[PDB]
Design an enzyme around this catalytic site. Structure first.
Site, mmCIF file in Angstrom:
data_model
loop_
_atom_site.group_PDB
_atom_site.id
_atom_site.type_symbol
_atom_site.label_atom_id
_atom_site.label_comp_id
_atom_site.label_asym_id
_atom_site.label_seq_id
_atom_site.Cartn_x
_atom_site.Cartn_y
_atom_site.Cartn_z
ATOM 1 N N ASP A 1 -2.740 13.034 6.412
ATOM 2 C CA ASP A 1 -1.280 13.000 6.368
ATOM 3 C C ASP A 1 -0.654 12.974 7.760
ATOM 4 O OD1 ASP A 1 -1.604 13.100 3.595
ATOM 5 O OD2 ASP A 1 -0.594 14.965 3.313
ATOM 6 N N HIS B 1 -4.055 5.326 5.324
ATOM 7 C CA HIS B 1 -3.834 6.594 4.615
ATOM 8 C C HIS B 1 -4.559 6.597 3.253
ATOM 9 C CE1 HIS B 1 -1.188 9.640 2.423
ATOM 10 N NE2 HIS B 1 -1.609 10.310 3.483
ATOM 11 N N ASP B 2 -4.469 5.494 2.509
ATOM 12 C CA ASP B 2 -5.184 5.359 1.243
ATOM 13 C C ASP B 2 -6.705 5.477 1.457
ATOM 14 O OD1 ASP B 2 -2.820 4.951 -0.143
ATOM 15 O OD2 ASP B 2 -3.178 2.888 -0.649
ATOM 16 N N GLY C 1 -0.181 1.595 -5.288
ATOM 17 C CA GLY C 1 -0.672 0.390 -4.627
ATOM 18 C C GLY C 1 -2.006 0.466 -3.906
ATOM 19 N N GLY D 1 2.585 3.867 -1.488
ATOM 20 C CA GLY D 1 2.852 4.399 -2.802
ATOM 21 C C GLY D 1 1.936 3.736 -3.782
ATOM 22 N N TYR E 1 -7.734 9.094 2.217
ATOM 23 C CA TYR E 1 -7.852 9.855 0.974
ATOM 24 C C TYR E 1 -9.127 9.456 0.213
ATOM 25 C CZ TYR E 1 -3.088 11.890 0.873
ATOM 26 O OH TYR E 1 -1.940 12.623 1.117
ATOM 27 N N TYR F 1 0.765 -1.243 0.000
ATOM 28 C CA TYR F 1 0.000 0.000 0.000
ATOM 29 C C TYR F 1 0.797 1.294 0.000
ATOM 30 C CZ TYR F 1 -4.125 -2.768 0.194
ATOM 31 O OH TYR F 1 -5.137 -3.642 -0.131
ATOM 32 N N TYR G 1 -1.487 22.359 1.709
ATOM 33 C CA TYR G 1 -2.027 22.840 2.976
ATOM 34 C C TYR G 1 -0.864 23.376 3.808
ATOM 35 C CZ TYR G 1 -0.383 18.182 4.410
ATOM 36 O OH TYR G 1 0.389 17.061 4.641
HETATM 37 C C1 LIG Z 1 3.454 10.536 -5.708
HETATM 38 C C2 LIG Z 1 4.665 9.655 -5.709
HETATM 39 O O1 LIG Z 1 4.916 9.010 -6.709
HETATM 40 O O2 LIG Z 1 5.589 9.553 -4.587
HETATM 41 C C3 LIG Z 1 5.411 9.689 -3.227
HETATM 42 C C4 LIG Z 1 4.777 8.708 -2.474
HETATM 43 C C5 LIG Z 1 4.656 8.849 -1.092
HETATM 44 C C6 LIG Z 1 5.178 9.958 -0.433
HETATM 45 C C7 LIG Z 1 5.837 10.959 -1.135
HETATM 46 C C8 LIG Z 1 5.983 10.864 -2.514
HETATM 47 C C9 LIG Z 1 6.699 11.959 -3.254
HETATM 48 O O3 LIG Z 1 6.850 11.902 -4.463
HETATM 49 O O4 LIG Z 1 7.148 12.917 -2.643
HETATM 50 CA CA LIG Z 2 -1.351 3.432 -2.077
#
Ligand SMILES: CC(=O)Oc1ccccc1C(=O)O
Ligand SMILES: [Ca+2]
Length: 121
Positions: free
Chosen positions: A89, A47-48, A31, A29, A51, A27, A64
């Site tokens: 977050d 967290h997913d 996922g 990233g 959102y 999960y 924010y």
């Molecule tokens: C959006 C992305 O691809 O990367 C992330 C995933 C989790 C946390 C931070 C990032 C980022 O790019 O900063």
């Molecule tokens: Ca995810």
């Protein structure tokens, strides 16, 4: 936005969001399937889901503001979306810090075929 989230993560854990939390487990990233591998992965699952409760907000790009009252993360007043994104977050950042002790590098770059099943938010 990812910009504030990454900063919150670094401040809280001392680890850079990429690549410590961008390809971890099922999960963290890119996922959204299978059973979370461990506590840290469950942080990402929640967290997913957080959102997911915000269909008409854009959490990746909407910025924010947050301040630190000593150690505490305090989300500053913004639009309704910005407020709710920040709370998602903040929760994830705290969850990561609470589970640092079991963070395992074996779950970094975890392959997609090992993420199996469903968990409903
Ligand atoms: C959006 C992305 O691809 O990367 C992330 C995933 C989790 C946390 C931070 C990032 C980022 O790019 O900063
Ligand atoms: Ca995810």
């Amino acid at each position: 936005s990812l910009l504030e989230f990454g900063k919150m993560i670094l401040e809280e854990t001392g680890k850079l969001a990429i690549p410590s939390y961008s390809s971890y487990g099922c999960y963290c990233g890119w996922g959204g399937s299978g059973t979370p591998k461990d506590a840290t992965d469950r942080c990402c699952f929640v967290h997913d889901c957080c959102y997911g409760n915000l269909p008409d907000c854009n959490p990746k790009s909407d910025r924010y503001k947050y301040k630190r009252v000593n150690g505490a993360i305090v989300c500053e007043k913004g639009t309704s979306c910005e407020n709710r994104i920040c709370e998602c977050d903040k929760a994830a950042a705290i969850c990561f810090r609470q589970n640092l002790n079991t963070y395992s590098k074996k779950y970094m770059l975890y392959p997609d075929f090992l993420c199996k099943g469903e968990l409903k938010c």
